[PDB]
Amino acid sequence: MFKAVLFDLDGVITDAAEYHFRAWKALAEEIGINGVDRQFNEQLKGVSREDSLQKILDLADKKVSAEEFKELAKRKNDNYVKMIQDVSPADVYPGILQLLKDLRSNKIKIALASASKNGPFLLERMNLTGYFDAIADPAEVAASKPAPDIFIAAAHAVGVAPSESIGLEDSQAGIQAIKDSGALPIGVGRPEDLGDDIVIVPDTSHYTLEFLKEVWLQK
Numbered sequence: 001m002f003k004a005v006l007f008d009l010d011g012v013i014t015d016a017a018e019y020h021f022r023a024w025k026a027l028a029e030e031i032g033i034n035g036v037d038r039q040f041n042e043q044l045k046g047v048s049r050e051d052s053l054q055k056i057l058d059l060a061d062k063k064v065s066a067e068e069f070k071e072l073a074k075r076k077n078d079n080y081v082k083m084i085q086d087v088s089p090a091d092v093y094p095g096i097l098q099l100l101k102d103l104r105s106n107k108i109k110i111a112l113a114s115a116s117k118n119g120p121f122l123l124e125r126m127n128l129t130g131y132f133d134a135i136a137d138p139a140e141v142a143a144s145k146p147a148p149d150i151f152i153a154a155a156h157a158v159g160v161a162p163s164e165s166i167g168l169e170d171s172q173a174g175i176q177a178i179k180d181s182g183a184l185p186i187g188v189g190r191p192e193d194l195g196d197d198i199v200i201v202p203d204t205s206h207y208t209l210e211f212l213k214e215v216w217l218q219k
């Protein structure tokens, strides 16, 4: 059987993106720039905080000093951090808490393989820290998804080869990173986005230990 599950965070454990979105939206609103909506957040998701601020300024063709840029960056941070103080166990996606308990009940290693630089804080807020054997630090990998580095690092952080692991992901580039690591990917979403050659569940309630074991045995 698989010895570890490498968990992406955003779109698997919880909706982490909503908070960054709401922070940029509030900042834009505050300084009188229109256009940052859910669709436009596409442009901001997975993107540097500073590239993100610049794209927002370009919606209104505004230029600013370095000090005003710094001020606006800080404001978005303040916004973001205030909002994530309200994250709780109620923000855990369905199935995930029971999955984590079952994986620990079954002695399988659990690691985080998230691009979130606030993963530890977010797991603490969700009361999940205790389930995790390791958190792969996205600041310590040279390449983001779709490069495999973060899944390799997560597997290694629990003393396993990626070939002994399942990866769970909601993103196409994440699925690619899992594949290229050696680990076995199981997606949440749809094949149109994730690919036609992996097992995909429609939502996280389907991620059960029973289901992962069956997928492992069938692959």
Ligand SMILES: [Mg+2]
Pocket (backbone or CB within 6 Å): 008, 009, 010, 011, 012, 169, 170, 171, 174
């Ligand atoms: Mg994700």
